[PDB]
């Protein structure tokens, strides 16, 4: 039946927003319907910074941290653990944590 | 738009009466509702209601004493012959002994038992009980 209050999307009062492809299967989905993840990770491993500091002529280094927005279709997201099917009463829980 | 101020009047009273409010406000305060309120007023269904005459037909406030239970309008105002007035009441009145149906009439605006008594009919305005 009607599974969700907002059908699957953060779309209220437009009629159309935009198509966006997925970073895994390349499936065109609305941008708001996508699973947005601000993947904030370093170029290197956590244990990796020690050798960089040892192997740099810069004693005081900056530790760069890359940014990339993985726009995910729910077909890929569920398979990729990114989201989990939740309880019907717990479906309303919109809190990120 | 407000196709019938009488309809929106009796609608508003029922909405607030079901809530149990001691006072209800009606707009745009025509006389047909004012004449309608008089009929309830002599029948105790309604309390002291204050008419506020602003220069744009104003509005009213009605200190209903939580006394009636359901007052409604029959829109549009079907005509009725005296031989069939009882036929109308049966479909609208919870009981014969109590509850009235309001008939507009060139004689005036009155509930059905007096309209029957004085023996004149007209078009149906609404029902009160």
């Amino acid at each position: 039946p009607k599974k969700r209050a907002s059908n699957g999307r953060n779309k209220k009062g437009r009629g159309h927003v935009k198509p966006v492809r997925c970073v895994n299967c390349s499936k065109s989905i609305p941008k708001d319907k996508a699973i947005k993840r601000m993947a904030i990770r370093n170029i290197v491993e956590a244990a990796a910074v020690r050798d960089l500091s040892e192997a740099s002529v810069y004693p005081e280094y900056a530790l760069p941290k890359t940014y990339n927005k993985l726009h995910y279709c729910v077909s890929c997201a569920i398979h990729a653990r990114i989201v989990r099917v939740r309880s019907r009463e717990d479906r309303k829980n919109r809190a990120p944590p | 738009t407000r196709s019938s101020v009488l309809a929106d009047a009796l609608n508003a009273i029922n909405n607030a009466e079901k809530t149990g409010k001691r006072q209800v406000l009606i707009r745009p305060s025509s006389k047909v509702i004012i004449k309608f309120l008089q009929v309830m007023q002599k029948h105790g269904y309604i309390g002291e209601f204050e008419y506020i005459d602003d220069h744009r037909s104003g509005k009213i406030v009605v200190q209903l004493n939580g006394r009636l239970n359901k007052c409604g309008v029959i829109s549009p105002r079907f005509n009725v012959k005296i031989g069939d007035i009882e036929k109308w009441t049966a479909n609208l009145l919870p009981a014969r002994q109590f509850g009235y149906v309001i008939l507009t009439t060139s004689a005036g605006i009155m509930d059905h038992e007096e309209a029957r008594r004085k023996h004149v009919s007209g078009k149906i305005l609404g029902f009160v009980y």
Partner: protein, 217 residues
């Protein structure tokens, strides 16, 4: 014998409460079936339903049994109870006990003038549980009980002699119609008439004027 637990039972055990209507005048909650046994010895029953209903489990269709029983003598009191029990006969006794607990009165009215004793209901009443809506329309004296074979017996127990029932929704379901009849039948006292407009001194609690008699800790 019967040792009461509620104050109502203990106060009834004093014998002070002898009027059933006092329970309903003050809307006293009921928890013990013996209360109506003592207060209304002249009380009969009749079973409407014997329905098998099963939970589909790992074991299989473990068929529980739900039965509905009406109770109330024709003096103006009716109580309708539903209960689900595995044994067929225990369901009858389990259902009636809650039915005694759920007893409700009736306002018996007159169709027209105030002649004689009351015969019918005093107003047309709203009742709807599930999709079923039963509308109890007052009828003139002697017109008979015009209703469903199941529902009309509920009215016969209630002691009203003439009424018109306008059934709506899936009236084929018997449990809803019985409850819809029960919801509608008890709406008589929820409906106000001008003869009732007169204020009353709001009679005080017999739970306090018959007063603390038992539970003497």
């Amino acid at each position: 014998g019967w040792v009461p637990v509620t104050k109502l039972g203990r106060l009834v055990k004093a014998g002070k409460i002898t009027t059933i209507e006092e329970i309903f005048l003050h809307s006293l909650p009921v928890k013990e079936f013996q209360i109506i046994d003592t207060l209304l010895p002249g009380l009969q029953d009749e079973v409407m339903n014997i329905k098998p209903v099963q939970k589909q489990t790992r074991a299989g269709q473990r068929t529980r049994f739900k039965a509905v029983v009406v109770v109330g003598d024709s003096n103006g009191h009716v109580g309708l109870g539903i209960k689900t029990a595995k044994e067929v006969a225990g369901a009858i006794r389990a259902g009636i006990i809650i039915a005694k607990l759920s007893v409700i009165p009736i306002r018996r009215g007159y169709w027209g003038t105030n002649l004689g004793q009351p015969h019918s209901l005093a107003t047309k009443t709203t009742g709807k549980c599930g999709s079923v809506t039963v509308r109890l329309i007052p009828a003139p004296r002697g017109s008979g009980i015009v209703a469903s074979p199941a529902v009309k017996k509920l009215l016969q127990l209630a002691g009203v002699e003439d009424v018109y029932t306008q059934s709506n929704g899936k009236t084929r379901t018997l449990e809803n119609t019985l409850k819809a009849a029960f919801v509608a039948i008890g709406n008589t006292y929820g409906f106000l008439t001008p003869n009732l407009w007169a204020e009353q001194p709001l009679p005080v609690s017999p739970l306090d004027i018959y007063s603390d008699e038992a539970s003497a800790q």
